UniProtKB/Swiss-Prot annotation, chain C:
PANTHER family (alphabetical): OS05G0170800 PROTEIN
Name of this protein: Protein ApaG
Signal peptide residues on this chain, from the entry's feature table: none
SUPFAM superfamilies: ApaG-like
Residue intervals of the ApaG domain: 1-123
Length: 121, 122, 123, 122
């Protein structure tokens, strides 16, 4: 059952009309991420890798350190959640990526972020 | 126009019966905060100050670093949210406070938290 | 004595020949900062402001968050030290700045960094 | 040419008599570390792994996050230094390890710490 090092991620995308203009191919989505330490030991999120694909198969990548300027050391059971934006020239698209993390024992590990869909309601 | 350093804060309280004994004035509210970067430049949340006021005008202050152990550096457009609790000896009260923040330029600035109220859904 | 929130900073600059060329007006110095919590409560380093001045009075400013991409919450007594570089077209110059910090009680405060000079080994 | 992600590590051991007892075979060594960004891009130290060997080839390992509670993000040319201790049953031994790091681009890489020795000055 329980694992020593496990982090669970849930992402809920949503279109934002309030600041989008499909008339000129301006689509703005907002995805809210929920990282949850589901393992038996503390673990820290280090870096993030993102792959956003267009409605026309146009790939774009983002790489950086930490999530919203931090690399939280999550105790087993706690959560960390933020919401960031994703612009697209098409009304639909996908997003998939990776969070690079590390257990308290220092050994790094990867927690994949399942590819999800993005489209107007 | 648009400000270079600005963060808007919204809170949603909600009484929690399952862990409060009104029989002994032990009221427990849960609150969620949404800090969103409205300005045009990256900004970060450093420390908080809460002034929770009692139904009988009794006050209790809280002062510490970060929010639920985090000091998010929110890019413009990004938002960070957390849920925390608040005890009260009365079924209604108001929480108000400040967040001490700093822009990507390292300069500190304050973002006030508007006085909102906590009340039993009853 | 012994204040509630206090951080003392010591900086030791040093010209670096191995990567400097005075014939091209390329002077590279390395300063080593040493932050020490000299107060009764923990405190955290948040941001830094640097004013570097030229041998010809030419100013340059650097502002950013943290020190070495970190904002250490120093326990009373512990220290944090790193060394960063400082390029200059002149063989001498000064550096003066500010660290913006915050006590564990969330109250912010500033620990000023006294103006020191940079010059080649001799003067 | 010059590497994009490269960190150089140097250590200076130092026996500490006033904090050890040879008689009881309790040898205490202090050691300072200098990590310098020799690469062309910013890099950060995340976690450490140490393998300290005994004069009698007795191993002892250590694994943790950060270096003395810090995970410096060194701009190229910058360096971070700290001092820790190392207990020993013998008056001589070696310490060798690894630092797990990440480039500003988030990709993790490893910077090894070459085996160096600890020994009483006498």
């Amino acid at each position: 059952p329980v694992k020593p090092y496990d982090l669970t991620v849930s992402v809920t995308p949503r279109y934002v009309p309030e600041q989008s203009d499909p008339s000129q191919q301006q689509y703005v989505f907002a995805y809210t991420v929920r990282i949850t330490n589901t393992g038996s030991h503390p673990a820290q999120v280090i870096s993030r890798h993102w792959i956003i694909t267009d409605g026309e198969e146009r790939v774009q990548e983002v790489r950086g350190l930490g999530v919203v300027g931090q690399q939280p050391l999550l105790a087993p059971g706690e959560t960390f959640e933020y919401t960031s934006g994703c612009p697209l020239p098409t009304p639909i698209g996908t997003m998939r990526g990776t969070y690079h993390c590390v257990g308290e024992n220092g050994i790094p590990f990867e927690v994949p972020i399942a590819e999800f869909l993005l489209a107007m309601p």
